[PDB]
TrEMBL record, chain A:
It is found in: Membrane. It comes from the Bacteria. Belongs to the V-ATPase 116 kDa subunit family. This is Archaeal/vacuolar-type H+-ATPase subunit I. It comes from Thermus thermophilus JL-18. The chain holds residues 152 to 201 of 652 of the full protein.
Length: 50, 62
C-alpha cells in the first residue's frame, strides 16, 4: 500500500528500499530535499508514520 | 531517473554563484577605470593652473 501511495505521490524519482530482520521489514524511503512534505503526506495518507 | 534530479539541484547554484562573481569582477574593474581616469582629471587641471599663474607672475615681474 505504502509503495503505491509513494509512487503516485512522488513519481519515479523516489527510492523505496527495504531489508528484513525476521518478521516485518524496516523500510526506508529516500527522497530529494524539498520533496520532504510530499513524501510525508504520502505516508500519512496510508496511516504509516516516521 | 533519480540521478538526473541530483544533477539539476547543483546545476543551477553553480550558475547563479558564477554569474554573480563575474559581475563583481566586472564591477570592481569598472570603478577601477573610472577612478584612475578621475585622478588624472584633477592632475590635468592642476598643471594648467600652474602655467596660467606662472605666466602672469613673469609678466608682472618683468
Amino acid at each position: 500500500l505504502v509503495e503505491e501511495a509513494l509512487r503516485k505521490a512522488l513519481e519515479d524519482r523516489y527510492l523505496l528500499a527495504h531489508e528484513a530482520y525476521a518478521g516485518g521489514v524496516p523500510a526506508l524511503v529516500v527522497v530529494h530535499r524539498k520533496e520532504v512534505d510530499q513524501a510525508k503526506a504520502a505516508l500519512s495518507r496510508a496511516g504509516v508514520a516516521e | 531517473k533519480l540521478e538526473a534530479i541530483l544533477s539539476q539541484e547543483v546545476e543551477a547554484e553553480i550558475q547563479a554563484l558564477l554569474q554573480e562573481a563575474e559581475a563583481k569582477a566586472e564591477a570592481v574593474k569598472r570603478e577601477a577605470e573610472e577612478k584612475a581616469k578621475a585622478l588624472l582629471q584633477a592632475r590635468e587641471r592642476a598643471l594648467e593652473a600652474q602655467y596660467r599663474a606662472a605666466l602672469r607672475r613673469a609678466e608682472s615681474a618683468g
